[PDB]
Design a protein around this ligand. Structure first.
Ligand SMILES: [Zn+2]
Lengths: 157, 191, 171
């Protein structure tokens, strides 16, 4: 369950389609929307290429634009985008990139590093109540350190 | 002294949870330390079949021990007596833990009647898990319909039997009340 | 929970589409049936990355049906629930014994026994909401939902959420 017990399809050794071992890659609400729209950029980029021969509104107004770009029946993807904007709290990808560099410094398993980014809390104890994974892997003080650093980055856009 | 309380200790188990005659077999153990089975058969005028299992209840519950009284009579015949020995400290072992687990068991039915677990479609004769439930509740619905009856369910393991078990628990403590400290009275010496 | 994933798909291409431009229809169907789909094994398949560099290697013609069989490997992002996990959400409709919290693409239900006792159900309210000692939790309310159970059925994942614990109910 939520205690680092994930299936074969979600092991650390996520073999890329080139056939070699690689680390499991998870995504929190700190990268999901900022990668989905970016990929949609490529999608519309080819969509017009081969055709030749706050954050809230930037979410949905462009969601409909890429609904034009996509097949449009994936409105549940739009639900996910909405869920992101309502609860994904990063921007200016270098922001979250510094965050992730710090979390790489944390020596935390990528599941846990995603747990941190996804959750927006105040104390180490709140995390331990929500993330039994993140209770002792680092000093709880360091937990609050990085929680506070997030709160510094916790700015609504 | 303490061993006398052990002598009386098994009487608690024997005269409460068994019939009247069960102490009549136990009494004979206290009556004669080396209690010959052939004699104990005559003492209560019970036949071989009737006396047999009575010792087993005392044997199995570590209360008695049928010691193989092999000996050589004058006639040189195969002489055997089931000498019902009194293993006082080991019978304490049997009474001690038997009081231990029963208190847990009557507690178990209480918690089960406070946490509904499953469901039931009494129309389609189908019980459901909550995961089963979350499959046929419609977003236009408030209770999970069925697939054979397409009808709502009923919660399973509700709290109408909860009060039944507390009396059993209370009756357990009030009836085991003479037994609990009678063991600990002996356990002061640990003999 | 969101993951970047590399998935392999086998797509059957009916013979009529055997133009010089087969890969057109190929990528087409890939998107048409992979983005935004539910799997019991990977969770809702949200979006596909690298629309161009997709391994499309070689067809096989099924011995009958003459339809080519293609084994597409591609890299995408999926959303997967897990038991015991903590999420946000918002209700959609009401139930007599709990409420169904739309956690993004998927809707997570919280049952009557899954809620704290003080959170009682008001049927009279419109919409019938769930009222705690401190919180009246309604359709648009933001609920901190914890994922208790998950259904791994192919094409349909169902999640059991509960607010009986702390830090739950309203976010
Ligand atoms: Zn039925």
């Amino acid at each position: 369950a939520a205690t680092l017990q994930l299936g074969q399809e979600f092991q650390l050794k996520q073999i890329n389609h080139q056939g070699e071992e690689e680390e499991l890659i998870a995504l929190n609400l700190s990268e999901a929307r900022l990668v989905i729209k970016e990929a949609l950029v490529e999608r519309r980029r080819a969509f017009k290429r081969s055709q030749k021969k706050t954050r809230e509104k930037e979410l949905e107004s462009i969601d409909v634009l890429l609904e034009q770009t996509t097949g449009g029946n994936n409105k549940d993807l739009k639900n996910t985008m909405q869920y992101l904007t309502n609860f994904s709290r990063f921007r200016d990808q270098e922001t979250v990139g510094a965050v992730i560099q710090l979390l790489k410094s944390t020596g935390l398993h990528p599941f846990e590093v995603a747990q941190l980014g996804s959750l927006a809390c105040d104390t180490a104890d709140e995390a331990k109540t929500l993330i039994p994974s993140l209770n002792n892997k680092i000093s709880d003080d360091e937990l609050e350190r990085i929680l506070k650093e997030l709160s510094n980055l916790e700015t609504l856009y | 002294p303490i061993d006398d309380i052990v002598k009386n200790l098994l009487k608690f188990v024997v005269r409460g949870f068994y019939g009247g005659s069960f102490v009549l077999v136990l009494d004979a153990i206290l009556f004669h330390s080396v209690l010959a089975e052939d004699d104990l058969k005559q003492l209560l005028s019970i036949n071989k079949t009737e006396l047999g299992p009575l010792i087993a209840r005392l044997r199995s519950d570590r209360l008695i021990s049928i010691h193989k009284q092999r000996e050589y009579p004058p006639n040189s015949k195969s002489v055997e007596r089931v000498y019902y020995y009194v293993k006082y400290p080991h019978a304490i072992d049997a009474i001690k833990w038997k009081v231990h687990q029963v208190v847990q068991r009557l507690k178990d039915d209480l918690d089960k009647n406070s946490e509904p677990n499953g469901y039931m479609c009494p129309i389609c004769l189908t019980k459901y898990t909550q995961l089963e439930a979350v499959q046929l509740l419609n977003f236009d619905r408030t209770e999970f319909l069925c697939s054979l009856c397409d009808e709502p369910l009923v919660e399973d393991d509700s709290g109408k039997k909860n009060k039944e078990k507390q009396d059993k628990l209370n009756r357990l403590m009030d009836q085991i009340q003479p037994i609990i400290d009678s063991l600990k009275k002996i356990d002061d010496s640990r003999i | 929970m969101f993951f970047i994933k590399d998935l392999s798909l086998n797509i059957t291409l009916h013979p009529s589409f055997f133009g010089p431009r087969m890969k057109q229809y190929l990528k087409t169907k890939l998107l048409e049936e992979v983005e935004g789909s539910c799997t019991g094994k990977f969770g809702y398949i949200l979006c596909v990355l690298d629309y161009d560099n997709i391994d499309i290697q070689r067809g096989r013609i099924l011995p009958t049906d003459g339809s080519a069989e293609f084994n597409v490997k591609y890299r995408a992002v999926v959303f997967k629930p897990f038991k015991g996990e903590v999420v946000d959400g918002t209700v959609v409709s009401c139930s007599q014994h709990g409420f169904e919290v739309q956690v993004g693409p998927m809707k997570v239900f919280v049952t009557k026994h899954l809620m704290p006792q003080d959170l009682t159900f008001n049927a009279g309210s419109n919409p019938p909401s769930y009222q705690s000692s401190e919180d009246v939790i309604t359709i648009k309310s933001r609920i901190r939902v914890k994922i208790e159970g998950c259904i791994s059925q192919v094409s349909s994942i169902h999640a059991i959420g509960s607010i009986k614990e702390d830090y739950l109910g309203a976010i």
